[PDB]
Amino acid sequence: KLHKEPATLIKAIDGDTVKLMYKGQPMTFRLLLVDTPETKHPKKGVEKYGPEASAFTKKMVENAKKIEVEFDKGQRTDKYGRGLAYIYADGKMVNEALVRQGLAKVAYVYGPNNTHEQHLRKSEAQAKKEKLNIWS
């Protein structure tokens, strides 16, 4: 079973990445299962909707009373040393909120870190149906 753990916001970095104090250690977290438009992307630097997805993740974690991280059941850090997790701001999953607004698409999923994949795909199908942001 997955469980939520407390964390503290240090800084939002991009739509898909936030730095948190987790267990008294500063680290960078990559949001599981979502691909956002980026402002810190190699070659293609600032993409269309990159500003807007960065601003949305920043506003959601900055205004939160409690942030929690939920690891999935496979590896907990990627090859760049980033924590791989579902991030919750006051009980609402940031990964799902971005997909529901059309500011992220669900990533190509493989491997054991796939628990909320069907939930996110349902939210993406709704954002697409409503022609929101990435899908307008």
Catalytic annotation present for 96: no
Q: Does the annotation place 78 within a ligand binding site?
A: no
3-state secondary structure of 8: strand
How many Å apart are CA 76 and CA 15, to the nearest integer?
20
- 76 counts as catalytic: no
d(CA 77, CA 82): 5
The two three-digit tokens of residue 136, written as one number: 């307008």
Element (H, E) at 88: strand 83-89
We report the CATH number of the domain holding residue 57 as 2.40.50.90
Strands 83-89 and 25-31, how do they pair? parallel
Is 35 annotated to bind a ligand? Reply is yes
Which one of the listed residues 38, 68, 96, 124 is annotated catalytic?
A: 38
- Catalytic residue, candidates 52, 70, 82, 117: 82
Residues 6 or more apart from 97 whose CB is under 8 A from it? 56, 60
Please give the tally of structural domains in the chain: 1
For 105-112, which contacts have Cβ atoms below 8 Å and span 24 or more sequence positions? 105/34, 105/35, 105/134, 106/33, 106/34, 106/35, 107/33, 107/34, 107/35, 109/33, 111/74, 111/75, 112/72, 112/73, 112/74, 112/75
- Cα separation, 86 vs 118, whole angstroms: 14
Residues ≥6 apart with Cβ < 8 Å to 98: 15, 31, 34, 36, 53, 56, 57, 104
For 6, 44, 56, 121, the CA distances from 107, given in Å and listed in that order, are 25, 18, 19, 10
Q: Is 121 a catalytic residue?
A: no
How far is Cα 76 from Cα 83, in angstroms, rounded to an integer? Answer: 6
| Three-class secondary structure of residue 10 per DSSP | strand
Domain residues for 25? Answer: 1-136
